[PDB]
Amino acid sequence: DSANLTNRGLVERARRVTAAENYDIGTRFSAMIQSGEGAWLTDVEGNRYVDLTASSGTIILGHRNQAVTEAITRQIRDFGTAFASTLSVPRVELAERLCERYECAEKVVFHKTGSEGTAMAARLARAATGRELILSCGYHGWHEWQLAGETFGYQQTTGVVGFGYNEKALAKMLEAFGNEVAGVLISPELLYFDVEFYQRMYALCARYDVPFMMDEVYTGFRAGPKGVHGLGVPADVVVVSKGLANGHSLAAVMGRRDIIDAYDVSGIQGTYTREVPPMAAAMAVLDVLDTPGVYEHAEAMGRRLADGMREILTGEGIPNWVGGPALMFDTVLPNDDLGWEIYKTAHDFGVYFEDSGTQLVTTAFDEAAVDHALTAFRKATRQVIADRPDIAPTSGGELTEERKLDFAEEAFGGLLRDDERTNALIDETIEKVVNRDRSIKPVLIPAQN
Amino acid sequence: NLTNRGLVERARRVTAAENYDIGTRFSAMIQSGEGAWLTDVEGNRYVDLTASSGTIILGHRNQAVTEAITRQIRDFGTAFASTLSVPRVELAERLCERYECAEKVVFHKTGSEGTAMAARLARAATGRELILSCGYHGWHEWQLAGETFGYQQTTGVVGFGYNEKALAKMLEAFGNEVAGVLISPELLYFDVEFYQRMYALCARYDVPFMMDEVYTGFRAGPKGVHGLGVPADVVVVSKGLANGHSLAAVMGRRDIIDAYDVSGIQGTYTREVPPMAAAMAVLDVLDTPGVYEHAEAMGRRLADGMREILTGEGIPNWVGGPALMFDTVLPNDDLGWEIYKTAHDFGVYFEDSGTQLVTTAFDEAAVDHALTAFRKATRQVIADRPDIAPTSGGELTEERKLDFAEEAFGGLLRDDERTNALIDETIEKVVNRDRSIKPVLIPAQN
Ligand SMILES: *Cc1c(COP(=O)(O)O)cnc(C)c1O
Numbered sequence: 001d002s003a004n005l006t007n008r009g010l011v012e013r014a015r016r017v018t019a020a021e022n023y024d025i026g027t028r029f030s031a032m033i034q035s036g037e038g039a040w041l042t043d044v045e046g047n048r049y050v051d052l053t054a055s056s057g058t059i060i061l062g063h064r065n066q067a068v069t070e071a072i073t074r075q076i077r078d079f080g081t082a083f084a085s086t087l088s089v090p091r092v093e094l095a096e097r098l099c100e101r102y103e104c105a106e107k108v109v110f111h112k113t114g115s116e117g118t119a120m121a122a123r124l125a126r127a128a129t130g131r132e133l134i135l136s137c138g139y140h141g142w143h144e145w146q147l148a149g150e151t152f153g154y155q156q157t158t159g160v161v162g163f164g165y166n167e168k169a170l171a172k173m174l175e176a177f178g179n180e181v182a183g184v185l186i187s188p189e190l191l192y193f194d195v196e197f198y199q200r201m202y203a204l205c206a207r208y209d210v211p212f213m214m215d216e217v218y219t220g221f222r223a224g225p226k227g228v229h230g231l232g233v234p235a236d237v238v239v240v241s242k243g244l245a246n247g248h249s250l251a252a253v254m255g256r257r258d259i260i261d262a263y264d265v266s267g268i269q270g271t272y273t274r275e276v277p278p279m280a281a282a283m284a285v286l287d288v289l290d291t292p293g294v295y296e297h298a299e300a301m302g303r304r305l306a307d308g309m310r311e312i313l314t315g316e317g318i319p320n321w322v323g324g325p326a327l328m329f330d331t332v333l334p335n336d337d338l339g340w341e342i343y344k345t346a347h348d349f350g351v352y353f354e355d356s357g358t359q360l361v362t363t364a365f366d367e368a369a370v371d372h373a374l375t376a377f378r379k380a381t382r383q384v385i386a387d388r389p390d391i392a393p394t395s396g397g398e399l400t401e402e403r404k405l406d407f408a409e410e411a412f413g414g415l416l417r418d419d420e421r422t423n424a425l426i427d428e429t430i431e432k433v434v435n436r437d438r439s440i441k442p443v444l445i446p447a448q449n
Numbered sequence: 450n451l452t453n454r455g456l457v458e459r460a461r462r463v464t465a466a467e468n469y470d471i472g473t474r475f476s477a478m479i480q481s482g483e484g485a486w487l488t489d490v491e492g493n494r495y496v497d498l499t500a501s502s503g504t505i506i507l508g509h510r511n512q513a514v515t516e517a518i519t520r521q522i523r524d525f526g527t528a529f530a531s532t533l534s535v536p537r538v539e540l541a542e543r544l545c546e547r548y549e550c551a552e553k554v555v556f557h558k559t560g561s562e563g564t565a566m567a568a569r570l571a572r573a574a575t576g577r578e579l580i581l582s583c584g585y586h587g588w589h590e591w592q593l594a595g596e597t598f599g600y601q602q603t604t605g606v607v608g609f610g611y612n613e614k615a616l617a618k619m620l621e622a623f624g625n626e627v628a629g630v631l632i633s634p635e636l637l638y639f640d641v642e643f644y645q646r647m648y649a650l651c652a653r654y655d656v657p658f659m660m661d662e663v664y665t666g667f668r669a670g671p672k673g674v675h676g677l678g679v680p681a682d683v684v685v686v687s688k689g690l691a692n693g694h695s696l697a698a699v700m701g702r703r704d705i706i707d708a709y710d711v712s713g714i715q716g717t718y719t720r721e722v723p724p725m726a727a728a729m730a731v732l733d734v735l736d737t738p739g740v741y742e743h744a745e746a747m748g749r750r751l752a753d754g755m756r757e758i759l760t761g762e763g764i765p766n767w768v769g770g771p772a773l774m775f776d777t778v779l780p781n782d783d784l785g786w787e788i789y790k791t792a793h794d795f796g797v798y799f800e801d802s803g804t805q806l807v808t809t810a811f812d813e814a815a816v817d818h819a820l821t822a823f824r825k826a827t828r829q830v831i832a833d834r835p836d837i838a839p840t841s842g843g844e845l846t847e848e849r850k851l852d853f854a855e856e857a858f859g860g861l862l863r864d865d866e867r868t869n870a871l872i873d874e875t876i877e878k879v880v881n882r883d884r885s886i887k888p889v890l891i892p893a894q895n
């Protein structure tokens with residue numbers, strides 16, 4: 001396979017042995033990438049593309065950042081990968097770095113994935129508090145309890161209440177049964193909500209002595225160089241992973257000492273948590289992001305792309321809302337088909353836009369890469385308007401309140417209406433928690449008797 | 450410069466879980482390894498028999514693995530917008546050719562996620578609720594509770610504790626509710642035929658047989674327990690697969706692996722390419738003629754030498770299992786740990802759980818260094834701790850062997866009244882349960 005490969009040839013070859021049809025092919029754009037460098041990808045046939053996917057967000061610096069590659073390589077080649085001691089010098093150095101960098105970080109422990117990191121957060125909160133329930137919203141991974149918690153309501157078998165980014169719901173739940181709540185675990189969403197919304201949520205949780213835990217597996221290095229926490233939101237636990245080691249598998253659970261101290265009795269482990277090279281890569285990432293001007297230039301490139309996309313859509317008369325942080329901004333359109341069609345078509349013009357509508361520049365981006373992506377977006381939007389007028393309204397105006405409320409529920413389970421059904425759902429859920437048969441409960445470690 | 454106790458104190462304030470990170474690791478903090486040897490931060494050298502909890506199969510800093518991972522990282526990249534990659538395709542092809550059970554293979558980062566994928570796939574593919582389990586499968590709630598005999602209705606998992614009789618009665622009473630059997634092979638107390646019989650029993654109930662070989666996959670043999678002639682519908686491997694780099698693989702029958710999409714499994718690091726390159730180098734080394742056989746000879750050299758030392762000092766003992774994962778069972782649970790701890794003073798890291806793990810980099814000198822330290826440590830513990838070091842010879846009692854199986858892996862091997870009552874009690878609780886109470890199932894089972 002050293003030359004003369006084709007996208008279609010290897011896709012077919014992958015279908016025979018490993019490809020999940022929808023997850024691996026139908027959803028991915030159907031070229032197969034052979035290398036990356038900075039802001040650009042190269043497929044096995046030599047086609048080049050500007051990358052706005054960041055590999056689903058795990059990359060923050062760009063592909064093959066040399067500081068990260070050197071630090072990973074030195075560890076692997078000159079020292080080793082995994083030792084009989086779970087402690088290592090790079091693990092200690094990184095934990096010290098993280099504790100100095102974050103006011104919420106008094107102690108830090110590590111794992112391989114965001115799904116395991118947020119599971120660790122719930123396990124630690126339960127073991128530390130001796131309480132049963134987790135109140136959750138936002139995506140936390142692919143385990144059942146995480147997936148089910150994105151929907152508002154109560155899953156008694158997992159001990160998770162979903163509260164749908166609804167401030168009122170959370171306050172009423174804490175008032176009604178907060179003494180049973182081991183923690184709140186929320187993935188910050190920054191298109192619909194401001195920093196103050198999360199500051200008030202921390203304050204609410206602290207008034208009930210409930211740990212406030214932010215899942216910033218996604219936002220950790222894209223809401224700002226220190227995540228949402230670094231914008232002034234206090235936290236008892238923060239989980240990070242995407243960007244942490246620039247695409248290499250590493251997650252960090254950082255938090256206040258009495259919660260992290262519950263590790264031993266929580267039963268958390270994992271034979272790869274000790275893996276050393278990724279921790280050297282993470283310290284290289286932190287050195288790059290803390291270099292003066294780097295993060296500022298990246299945000300300028302994200303603003304350049306977002307503003308250009310807004311102009312292209314507004315100039316064509318397509319109703320649109322472009323918002324959010326510069327390094328993780330969303331584009332909302334009147335319907336869900338229009339964006340996907342544009343993003344797909346733009347692949348023909350040499351750019352990998354992220355299908356879901358959140359674009360993710362990296363620090364390696366320069367203006368030529370942004371402007372190549374705008375050229376492709378401009379051409380793709382014009383073609384979709386021409387070919388698919390049934391989904392491409394061009395008569396101006398703003399998104400309706402209906403669409404914005406519906407999209408929040410659809411996209412992230414945010415229940416943002418103050419109508420009777422939402423308030424009825426709030427009261428039903430609280431009733432189901434309060435009047436429950438308490439003999440039916442998830443497995444708790446340690447047991448809560 | 451840097452000291453063990455200096456770094457440990459630093460570690461305590463910022464990251465160290467006292468028991469898991471310190472209390473259970475023999476004092477020194479490792480700085481490097483090479484082949485069979487470790488070097489701590491003060492320069493002390495040690496023969497390594499832990500294999501870093503089994504993740505290492507070739508030894509530290511094997512050159513072919515390092516070359517493969519470095520080329521990928523430096524010349525191509527780490528993770529791409531396509532979840533498919535050329536090394537993923539090649540590794541899946543290679544694994545499918547290598548294993549009879551492997552019609553398709555998907556990947557993840559850890560054994561715990563690998564075995565979770567096995568259960569999610571079995572449920573999604575069969576549309577059934579229950580997983581019957583025994584043996585360690587990871588640190589998630591349902592995995593840990595599953596090691597204990599009994600039914601956990603909120604996870605949909607029944608532990609059957611390596612009890613053949615229990616399993617057969619369970620499948621007769623409620624096998625049409627069983628999405629899969631998930632077992633971690635134990636090869637000290639059981640032979641290959643035991644797992645062959647288990648495969649056949651699940652088969653005639655149309656129940657997928659899934660082997661968690663996260664541990665055994667390259668240490669029961671170069672192709673795991675499955676390679677010794679045990680058929681399986683799913684096999685999970687991980688430890689050894691990329692020689693310490695984080696990769697797991699879930700291999701199995703098309704109709705079960707094809708349920709990936711509807712199962713809701715994902716993970717943004719499952720596409721990570723460098724560990725797949727490392728795995729192909731590992732399979733290259735393992736399949737070089739002479740390499741695996743030589744490693745087993747070294748394991749037998751170590752095990753035989755340990756048996757000779759204990760028997761010659763009068764310590765009742767049982768040394769058994771495969772050469773690359775053999776166990777040393779002693780009359781009580783304190784003696785082993787005291788010997789292994791003391792042996793660290795003589796330049797060797799024994800695995801203090803009692804299962805020693807040579808790697809393919811071992812030579813006779815490395816084995817004999819471990820044996821020299823083991824002799825000195827055993828004799829010191831005998832002189833210093835006669836309260837836990839009986840020297841009157843003989844064999845382990847049947848009571849001790851039976852109790853150990855229960856303590857170490859939840860094996861209920863007794864044919865007594867209290868075991869049979871547990872079997873009947875568990876079946877009754879499954880059959881007569883409130884079937885409105887059920888775990889989260891993806892897709893929903895209606
Ligand atoms: C990606 C993500 C996760 C899951 O992390 P994985 O490594 O893919 O398991 C959890 N929470 C958030 C907010 C994420 O973006």
Ligand SMILES: *Cc1c(COP(=O)(O)O)cnc(C)c1O
Binds near residue numbers: 272562586663665
């Ligand atoms: C180690 C182990 C696991 C868990 O794997 P991790 O990578 O540590 O999560 C699961 N099953 C068996 C048999 C194991 O030995």
